[PDB]
Design an enzyme around this catalytic site. Structure first.
Site, PDB file in Angstrom:
ATOM      1  N   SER A  20       3.411  -4.120   0.974  1.00 19.76           N
ATOM      2  CA  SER A  20       4.708  -4.192   0.317  1.00 19.76           C
ATOM      3  C   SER A  20       4.855  -5.524  -0.377  1.00 19.76           C
ATOM      4  O   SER A  20       4.220  -6.491   0.019  1.00 19.76           O
ATOM      5  CB  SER A  20       5.824  -4.054   1.357  1.00 19.76           C
ATOM      6  OG  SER A  20       7.098  -4.343   0.805  1.00 19.76           O
ATOM      7  N   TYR A  41       9.777  -7.905   8.849  1.00 17.09           N
ATOM      8  CA  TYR A  41       9.075  -6.789   8.232  1.00 17.09           C
ATOM      9  C   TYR A  41       7.993  -7.389   7.322  1.00 17.09           C
ATOM     10  O   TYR A  41       6.897  -6.843   7.206  1.00 17.09           O
ATOM     11  CB  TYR A  41      10.042  -5.935   7.420  1.00 17.09           C
ATOM     12  CG  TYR A  41       9.368  -4.904   6.537  1.00 17.09           C
ATOM     13  CD1 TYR A  41       8.996  -5.218   5.221  1.00 17.09           C
ATOM     14  CD2 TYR A  41       9.129  -3.609   6.998  1.00 17.09           C
ATOM     15  CE1 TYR A  41       8.410  -4.265   4.395  1.00 17.09           C
ATOM     16  CE2 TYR A  41       8.545  -2.649   6.176  1.00 17.09           C
ATOM     17  CZ  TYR A  41       8.192  -2.986   4.876  1.00 17.09           C
ATOM     18  OH  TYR A  41       7.639  -2.045   4.052  1.00 17.09           O
ATOM     19  N   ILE A  57      10.393   1.956  -4.278  1.00 15.19           N
ATOM     20  CA  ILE A  57      10.027   3.340  -4.583  1.00 15.19           C
ATOM     21  C   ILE A  57      11.179   4.263  -4.183  1.00 15.19           C
ATOM     22  O   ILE A  57      11.676   4.191  -3.060  1.00 15.19           O
ATOM     23  CB  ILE A  57       8.751   3.802  -3.828  1.00 15.19           C
ATOM     24  CG1 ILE A  57       7.518   2.999  -4.276  1.00 15.19           C
ATOM     25  CG2 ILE A  57       8.521   5.295  -4.039  1.00 15.19           C
ATOM     26  CD1 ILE A  57       7.093   3.191  -5.723  1.00 15.19           C
ATOM     27  N   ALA A  58      11.592   5.122  -5.116  1.00 18.27           N
ATOM     28  CA  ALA A  58      12.682   6.075  -4.903  1.00 18.27           C
ATOM     29  C   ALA A  58      12.274   7.149  -3.911  1.00 18.27           C
ATOM     30  O   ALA A  58      11.585   8.109  -4.259  1.00 18.27           O
ATOM     31  CB  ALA A  58      13.099   6.713  -6.225  1.00 18.27           C
ATOM     32  N   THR A  59      12.698   6.961  -2.665  1.00 19.42           N
ATOM     33  CA  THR A  59      12.401   7.889  -1.580  1.00 19.42           C
ATOM     34  C   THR A  59      13.456   8.991  -1.503  1.00 19.42           C
ATOM     35  O   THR A  59      13.067  10.180  -1.548  1.00 19.42           O
ATOM     36  CB  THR A  59      12.333   7.151  -0.226  1.00 19.42           C
ATOM     37  OG1 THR A  59      13.557   6.439  -0.002  1.00 19.42           O
ATOM     38  CG2 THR A  59      11.173   6.166  -0.211  1.00 19.42           C
TER      39      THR A  59
END
Length: 252
Positions: A145, A158, A191-193
């Site tokens: 990421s 994270y 990212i469009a989840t």
């Protein structure tokens, strides 16, 4: 596999019941790969299998809890049997985020995120090793990421897990070279989840992209599949970002 395809390649994608992993399972499948994937949700996986096999995709999936060492060991055995002891691909996609400042994380928080984000990936990589090396043409693609290299709000821990993952990726590219295994990392951006502040924080990221938009699950997956193509034979030890230019920005 063909130069630009994954025909005859067996792959395991951890966490493919939705979003990115879902995109990765469809992507690899649509290029001729028989994918084995899993998740915690019993119900969601079966709805996935419904759609995957509907598009014709050659898939298979069981329920897993990657926080458990035994569950991970059991998984490899299960998949290592599904493919007869030969694994071409391994996509360490599983991960979680706990939105809290670094000083607010509890021991239960830290231990949980470390377990699924890094340890689970590392562990399944070692377990998969014999089968990737036995496949003659193995590939390991860790899903990192932009948060693993640059500061993002409520993602201090994270990010830490992803930073350790990136370094492990570089090292394994060298350590497993002799086994004809290429190890790379793919770091997605947005990212469009919902929460007023998290909406803006999500807005700041899209705003900082060159393309000024979120990516789609198949856009990140396109890079994972490619790294597995026989065509990418000389690519290894890299962390490549699929982020609409986010990583390269500063003042735009």
């Amino acid at each position: 596999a063909g130069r630009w395809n994954l025909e005859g390649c067996t792959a395991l994608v951890t966490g493919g019941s939705r979003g990115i992993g879902y995109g990765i399972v469809e992507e690899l499948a649509s290029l001729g790969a028989s994918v084995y994937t899993c998740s915690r949700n019993q119900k969601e996986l079966n709805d996935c299998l419904t759609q995957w096999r509907s598009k014709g995709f050659k898939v298979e999936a069981s329920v897993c809890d990657l926080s458990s060492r035994s569950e991970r060991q059991e998984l490899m055995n299960t998949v290592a049997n599904h493919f007869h002891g030969k694994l071409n691909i391994l996509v360490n996609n599983a991960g979680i985020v706990i939105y809290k400042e670094a000083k607010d994380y509890t021991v239960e928080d830290y231990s949980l995120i470390m377990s699924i984000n890094f340890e689970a990936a590392y562990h399944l990589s070692v377990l998969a090793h014999p089968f990737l090396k036995a496949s003659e043409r193995g590939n390991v693609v860790f899903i990192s990421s932009v948060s693993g290299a640059l500061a993002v709000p409520y993602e201090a821990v994270y990010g830490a897990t992803k930073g350790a993952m990136d370094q492990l990726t570089r090292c394994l590219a060298f350590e497993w070279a002799k086994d004809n295994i290429r190890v790379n990392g793919v770091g997605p951006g947005v990212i469009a989840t919902q929460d007023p502040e998290q909406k803006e924080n999500l807005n700041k990221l899209i705003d900082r992209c060159a393309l000024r938009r979120m990516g789609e699950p198949k856009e990140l997956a396109a890079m994972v599949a490619f790294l597995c193509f026989p065509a990418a034979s000389y690519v290894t030890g890299q962390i490549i970002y699929v982020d609409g230019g986010l990583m390269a920005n500063c003042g735009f």
